[PDB]
Amino acid sequence: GCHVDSRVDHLFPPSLYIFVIGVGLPTNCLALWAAYRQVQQRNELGVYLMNLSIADLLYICTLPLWVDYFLHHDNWIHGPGSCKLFGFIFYTNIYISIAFLCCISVDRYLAVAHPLRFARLRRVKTAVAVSSVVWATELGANSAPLFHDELFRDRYNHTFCFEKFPMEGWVAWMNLYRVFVGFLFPWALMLLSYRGILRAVRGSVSTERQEKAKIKRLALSLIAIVLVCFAPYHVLLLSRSAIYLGRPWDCGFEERVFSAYHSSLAFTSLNCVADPILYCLVNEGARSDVAKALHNLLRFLAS
Amino acid sequence: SELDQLRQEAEQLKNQIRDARKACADATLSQITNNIDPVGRIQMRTRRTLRGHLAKIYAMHWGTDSRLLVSASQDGKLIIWDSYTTNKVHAIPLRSSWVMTCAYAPSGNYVACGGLDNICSIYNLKTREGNVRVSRELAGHTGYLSCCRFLDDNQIVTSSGDTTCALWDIETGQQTTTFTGHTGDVMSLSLAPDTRLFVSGACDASAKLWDVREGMCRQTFTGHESDINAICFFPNGNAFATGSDDATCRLFDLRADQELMTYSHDNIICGITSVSFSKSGRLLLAGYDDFNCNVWDALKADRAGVLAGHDNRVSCLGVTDDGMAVATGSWDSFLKIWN
Amino acid sequence: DVQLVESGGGLVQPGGSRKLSCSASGFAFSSFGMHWVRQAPEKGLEWVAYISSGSGTIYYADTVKGRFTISRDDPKNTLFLQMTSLRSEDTAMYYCVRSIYYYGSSPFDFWGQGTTLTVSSGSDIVMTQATSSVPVTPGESVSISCRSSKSLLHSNGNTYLYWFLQRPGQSPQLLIYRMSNLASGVPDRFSGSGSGTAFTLTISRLEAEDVGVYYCMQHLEYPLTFGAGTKLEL
Amino acid sequence: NTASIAQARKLVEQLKMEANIDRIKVSKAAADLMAYCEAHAKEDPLLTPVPASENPFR
Amino acid sequence: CTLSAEDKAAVERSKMIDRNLREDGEKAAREVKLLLLGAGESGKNTIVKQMKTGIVETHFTFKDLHFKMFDVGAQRSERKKWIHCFEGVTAIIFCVALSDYDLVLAEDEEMNRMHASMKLFDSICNNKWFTDTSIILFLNKKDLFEEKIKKSPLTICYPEYAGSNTYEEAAAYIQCQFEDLNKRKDTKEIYTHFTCSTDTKNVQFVFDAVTDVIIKNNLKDCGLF
Ligand SMILES: CC(C)CCC[C@@H](C)[C@H]1CC[C@H]2[C@@H]3CC=C4C[C@@H](O)CC[C@]4(C)[C@H]3CC[C@]12C
Ligand SMILES: CC(C)CCC[C@@H](C)[C@H]1CC[C@H]2[C@@H]3CC=C4C[C@@H](O)CC[C@]4(C)[C@H]3CC[C@]12C
């Protein structure tokens, strides 16, 4: 019941995806290594960082199939068993990464704004239990699409996974939950935790304004990049659902925003490149640990 | 003037000693050893990593069975380790965390340790109650305790920052002999294989050979440009090696009363924190501030090999009595056993 | 000194239950593993149960497993056996045995004095101590042998053989551990030797105080087992 | 103040005791140190490595 | 598998030892380590009353921080052979007594006690083992200062001083003289307090300097600093 405008779908999505895979694979691998060293030093935020990094590395691992999907022209030449698996990872790892960013942000808040009072929550095994809850909760919560059939074909040349034009009711509801609970709820907590850290930081009297400047610029980047990468997609999920629920007997909206929808999904993949930079490579405390390891590895091999 | 007569004799005597030593300089080690095949490259591997300390390791000592070790760290703990299995046999809380030295008694019955508390504490490892307890605290030094070594279950030799060394009677708790003559802090002790002599090193950039029963200094050895941090004896008891902050090790012969060989390299500007010998005395091992341990061919002063693997300053070395293994400890909180 | 006192024994009817207690004092109880060992009216010794230090592990003899429960309460320094469905085969003197394991340790070096429980109306290593009794004139040497159905020599080099002496009216004393090591307090009159499956306890110059029953125990695997016991006479 | 005389005396007495030492020639001392190393070379496993089957550390 | 009944038990014991070592590790990690230094009898012994042969340790609790103070004075030995063992401390408390400005060392009549104090401060402050360890500097015996300066201007030890004989200015001058010995101002902070040997807030002064040190350390561990 539609005809989408897919003029740029074989171009923009695979362009970003080639970039994300080529950069993100070693970028996230370095992040896993760095996060690992932090865990063995008993820094809990190595637990959350390895889970963030593996969620992104996994996203990347599914992503080349999705590159095909778009390039062939939105045709999953691959049967239905593979929609449920890959696209479940494609569309759920967005929320897994957001949940881990949220957890890192909350731990940073407690460590900085409330030093001395929450020792029990910054233990490494506590963090492990939290990661288990985050993975299980988010994978469970977003499992609903699997009890539906995700593969669709139509008179027209598209063989869609996880999308239908016009969409159904079992989705309009998914599209809302994923914006209000999936994206905004954690994102708001990230905002509050970083604002709280900045208040703790500005009150420091042992921190020169030059360090305060670094902290504020980083704290803003850690909010703005998430909002920028995800809002362009989540904003359409709300528009599509709201329009559909208002008048299910229309696709005209979808028809005029079809390519925007897919461009935005491609856009959201950029967190798999940006997250490990803001979280593992930009701060030199991490970066020099990474560097000595790269030198030690090669020197070790060289003998 | 008694003061001037004595000062004049002292200078004349210093000259007699210097010339008596030059008179013996008809060779160096480094030339009689020209025709000796080199040990070749010595490639050791870590066989065990002993994990458990949460702080810098300051001391190590192998027991006489070549299987148990005692190590000490700024955790305020001593750990008795099973080197073959990597098991903790004991963990001993200390009354003072500022521990710089420890020692395993030859019998395996006692462990000694101490540091900035100026006390050598003796622990009884074999009790009816099943727990390690302090049997005796030896107080009397007025400086920090830099090194402990047992002669037997009732005798412990200590050195300290008060510039003296002392022989203690563990059972009475009294100091029986005070060994004086150093002017700087005493950093290390080494006991002769037969227990009759001991060599001490100090911040005087000198080392002294002491007669244990007499309470007398027999010989003073000089040559280092800086503080001596470590000393050990060559296995047959006729020489000792010393390591210092001038980044060299030196071999001294006791009968020659001379420096015999210098172990140094242009690329080492690090101090030496620990020295030890292999059973044949052919290899000299030294721990450095660059986090490496070098293995020197003791008869040539060649570098036979490097034990790399610590992430911080190597603080202590030990070699087992049967020669099977080398343990290294460091400020990175780990001990490693090499073969 | 080191002390273990068993209590809670007495007369029970079959099918009933009792709880034996064992109060420790004089030692770092929480650091020691503990065992219960029975001595039948027939005087053989049988291992019953083991509770490790920290209560990490529990082992039971097959004949009590599922019936008896072994427990520890470190803050009060006590052990217990909760014994359910007692049958008359369970009649025995019950002893607490102290045991600590680490390289170079001496396990089973202290036994309590036992309490008495009287109840009215495999792949196991078998230790055999052929001789039942041996009369020896005091002042002369003794040779007490023991055989095993399985080699007691482990690949780590240790042979896990223990020898104990029970003097009349007394609980067992450890004499020798791991084949040849004497227990503290044991005179050099005693010496162990042997290998594989054939072991010997040698006594040199017998004293009157050495007369009692000598028991052979293996500690290679659980259940721990004892031989019949050889009674030295005269 | 005679403290400096006592200090000079301690230095003199120790130096006289060290001056009176029968010192061995270095060529001999060096040769003996060497001979020890050769005699015990085969007993030293860090110099002449032990086959794994005889090595307690594998 | 493989291990004998006794070897398995030995392993179990080793594991219990590890659990206990970890618990003690966590307790130690929570404690605040303070190294207490000073220019000899500089009021050090008064500070420790409010904050209550070899090294002397003092335990102190305030606002749920457990502090452990290490008095390393009375060790007449070389600092270079032991001071590094204190590398891992939260802060160094350094005591100077301001009234010292008109005094000389008993051992050297020409050496002003205040300069001796500055020489020590510099040896610690710019020490390679303490490049990121903050200093809490206490200026003691201020009431005695304030009165002496009306009879003996600072010039007596600071000939370049050109301020008035006012303790507010004289005290500021001395503070500056110590703070300017810091050659690593962009790395380590100096917290200066005048205790006057009469204040009761000396505990609070340490507490606040310490919580500021702790937050900077958490910002470094958080990857934010
Ligand atoms: C559907 C599949 C991909 C879900 C996989 C979830 C995995 C990645 C989650 C669940 C359990 C988590 C692990 C829990 C425990 C540990 C041990 C810790 O020292 C490092 C993190 C680590 C290793 C976590 C890594 C991430 C983890 C393995
Ligand atoms: C110091 C540490 C323990 C703080 C941890 C805060 C964690 C538990 C908070 C912060 C963010 C929150 C998550 C935000 C988003 C979601 C996704 C939703 O579909 C289920 C609830 C869930 C999963 C929340 C669970 C609780 C949560 C993870």
What this model shows, in words?
The complex is a heteropentamer of chains A (303), B (339), C (234), D (58) and E (225). Chain A is mostly helical. Chain A is 74% helix and 2% strand. In chain A, strands 1-2 form a two-stranded antiparallel ribbon. In chain A, helix 1 runs antiparallel to helix 2, helix 2 runs parallel beside helix 4 (124-141) and helix 3 packs parallel to helix 5. Chain A is globular. Helix content of chain D is 53%, strand content 0%. Chain E has helices at residues 5-30, 44-50, 113-125, 142-148, 167-179, 202-221, and strands at 32-38, 56-62, 65-71, 91-97, 104-105, 108-112, 134-140, 190-194. In chain E, strand 5 (104-105) and strand 6 (108-112) form a beta hairpin. Chain E is elongated, with a radius of gyration of 22 Å. Chains in contact: A-E, B-C, B-D, B-E, C-E.
What would you call the structural class of chain E? alpha/beta
Structural class of chain C: mainly beta
Q: What is the name of the CATH architecture of the largest domain in chain E?
A: 3-Layer(aba) Sandwich
Helix content of chain E: 25-40%
Q: How would you write the strand order of the largest sheet of chain E?
A: 2-3-1-4-7-8
CATH superfamily of the largest domain in chain C: Immunoglobulins
Helix content of chain C: under 10%
Measured distance between first and last alpha carbons of chain E: 49 Å
How is this structure best summarized?
The complex is a heteropentamer of chains A (303), B (339), C (234), D (58) and E (225). Chain A has helices at residues 12-40, 45-71, 81-113, 124-141, 169-202, 209-246, 252-255, 258-267, 271-281, 284-302, and strands at residues 151-153, 159-161.
Short key terms for the protein model shown above:
heteropentamer; D: mainly alpha; 2 helices; E: 225 residues; 2 domains; 8 strands; membrane protein
What is the element layout, followed by pairings?
The complex is a heteropentamer of chains A (about 300), B (about 350), C (about 230), D (about 60) and E (about 220).
Chain A: H1 12-40, H2 45-71, H3 81-113, H4 124-141, E1 151-153, E2 159-161, H5 169-202, H6 209-246, H7 252-255, H8 258-267, H9 271-281, H10 284-302
Antiparallel strand pairs in A: 1-2
Helix pairs in contact in A: 1-2, 1-8, 1-9, 2-3, 2-4, 2-9, 3-4, 3-5, 5-6, 6-8, 6-9
Chain B: H1 2-22, H2 29-32, E1 46-50, E2 57-62, E3 68-73, E4 77-82, E5 87-93, E6 99-104, E7 110-115, E8 119-124, E9 133-139, E10 145-152, E11 155-160, E12 165-169, E13 175-179, E14 186-191, E15 197-202, E16 206-211, E17 216-222, E18 228-233, E19 239-244, E20 249-253, E21 258-263, E22 272-277, E23 283-288, E24 293-297, E25 302-307, E26 314-319, E27 326-330, E28 335-338
Chain C: E1 3-7, E2 10-12, E3 18-25, E4 33-39, E5 45-51, E6 58-60, E7 68-73, E8 78-83, E9 92-99, E10 110-111, E11 115-119, E12 127-128, E13 133-135, E14 142-148, E15 161-166, E16 173-177, E17 181-182, E18 190-195, E19 198-203, E20 213-218, E21 225-226, E22 230-233
Parallel strand pairs in C: 2-11, 13-22
Antiparallel strand pairs in C: 1-3, 3-8, 4-5, 4-9, 5-6, 7-8, 9-10, 9-11, 12-14, 14-19, 15-16, 15-20, 16-17, 18-19, 20-21, 20-22
Bound molecules: cholesterol (2 copies).
